[PDB]
Design goal:
Elements: E1 2-8, E2 32-41, E3 44-46, H1 52-61, E4 70-76, H2 83-89, H3 92-109, E5 113-117, H4 130-152, E6 158-163, H5 167-173, H6 176-180, E7 185-188, H7 222-231, E8 239-244, E9 246-252, E10 264-267, E11 279-281, H8 282-290, E12 294-298, E13 303-308, E14 311-314, H9 318-330, E15 335-339, H10 357-365
Parallel strand pairs: 1-2, 1-15, 2-4, 4-5, 5-6, 6-7, 7-8, 8-15
Antiparallel strand pairs: 2-3, 9-10, 9-11, 9-14, 12-13, 13-14
Helix pairs in contact: 3-4, 9-10
Length: about 375
């Protein structure tokens, strides 16, 4: 199995124990590491943070300690939008320029591949033609990677993509059978399945539907989404299940109603570390529990939740991660991916469950080897 962990280049800005740098990553924890995010200028891949080059060097340096660890650079993200991707894929000449820039960039900084994080072709501003042009882009990238490998006599660079979990976004975004022939791995973003934007409580990454889920709401679970991709042309082994190391919080409209689907009046507060509205990192949730929050188990969906007064959070813990990991194995998917490594309790000081409690759970459940992390009696 694969265990793919996203590192985010903005985690450096968090105060105190929240600060997360490339050197805070245990090199023997994950099989793949992905750096989020790279940008684009004039159809060419670029850095986004002032210190990205320094972070790239530390990030890819981790491979010195693990001979099987592979690294990828993710281009795009939420804030990036769709416009630059639309313009870049619009002509073969722009695509070649991008592809050439990517090969050069990845080889210069010592990455093993590229992860596409276009959110999304065919939606969120992106016109209908982008669905097919994404396939074409990925086809050409794979081909150029294949050719470059023979030119410089090294293993091929990898090409992967993070993809939508929403059914309508999936249907307007991807030509699944053809796209799946070119991508090495498909990172399905099976999280943010519910949030305060809906106006009622719901789980971030529920494994199964809630008993009252009808119609399109019945699609908002890991089980349905992963099976949709499988049934429509993506090889099980290439499909990687999305695991969130954070949850979404809510303000309860009525503190006496604390169930799934209880009315909410807005996003819960951003925490002092991640400072993201309606979101708490797992370690931020542990603080919430330490302050006496009532723990609930959403049994039909196999995920926890917690509440204190008018604040409610839906999230994932060790139990839910293990349950979904076991599920993943029963259904023969390629492994798990994690958003994000810097959101787990990496210090081990918040949750009293060891360092990286959530990602350690996945390493154990997926039976990852550690022989490649060996270190000799040489100084």
């Amino acid at each position: 199995y694969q265990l793919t962990c996203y590192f985010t280049n903005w985690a450096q800005y968090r105060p105190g124990l929240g600060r997360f740098m490339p050197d805070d990553i245990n090199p023997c924890l994950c099989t793949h590491l992905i750096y989020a995010f790279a940008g684009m200028q004039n159809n060419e891949i670029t850095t986004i943070e002032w210190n990205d080059v320094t972070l790239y060097q530390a990030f890819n340096g981790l491979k010195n300690k693990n001979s099987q660890l592979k690294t990828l650079l993710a281009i795009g993200g939420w804030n990036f939008g769709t416009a630059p991707f639309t313009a870049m894929v619009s002509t073969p000449e722009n695509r070649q320029t991008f592809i050439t820039s990517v090969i050069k960039f990845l080889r210069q900084y010592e990455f093993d591949g590229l992860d596409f994080d276009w959110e999304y072709p065919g939606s969120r501003g992106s016109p209908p033609q982008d669905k097919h042009l994404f396939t074409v882009l990925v086809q050409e990238m794979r081909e150029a990677f294949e050719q470059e490998a023979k030119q410089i006599n090294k293993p091929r660079l990898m090409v992967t993509a993070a993809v939508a979990a929403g059914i309508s976004n999936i249907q307007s975004g991807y030509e699944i059978p053809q796209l799946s022939q070119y991508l090495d791995y498909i990172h399905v973003m099976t999280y943010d399945l519910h949030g305060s934007w809906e106006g009622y409580t719901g789980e971030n990454s529920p494994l199964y539907k809630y008993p009252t889920d009808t119609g399109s709401n019945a699609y908002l679970n890991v089980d349905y989404v992963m099976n949709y991709w499988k049934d429509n042309g993506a090889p099980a082994e290439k499909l990687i299940v999305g695991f969130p190391t954070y949850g979404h919080n809510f303000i309860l409209s009525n503190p006496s109603n604390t169930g799934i689907g209880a009315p909410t009046s807005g996003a819960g507060p951003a925490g002092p570390y991640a400072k993201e509205s309606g979101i708490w990192a797992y370690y931020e949730i542990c603080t919430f529990l330490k302050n006496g929050a009532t723990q609930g188990w959403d049994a039909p969906q196999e995920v926890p939740y917690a509440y204190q007064g008018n604040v409610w959070v839906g999230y994932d813990n060790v139990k839910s991660f293990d349950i979904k990991a076991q599920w993943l194995k029963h259904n023969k998917f390629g492994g798990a991916m994690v958003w994000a490594i810097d959101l787990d309790d990496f210090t081990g000081t918040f949750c009293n469950q060891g360092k990286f409690p959530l990602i350690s759970t996945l390493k154990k459940a997926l039976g990852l080897q550690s022989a490649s992390c060996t270190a000799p009696a040489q100084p």
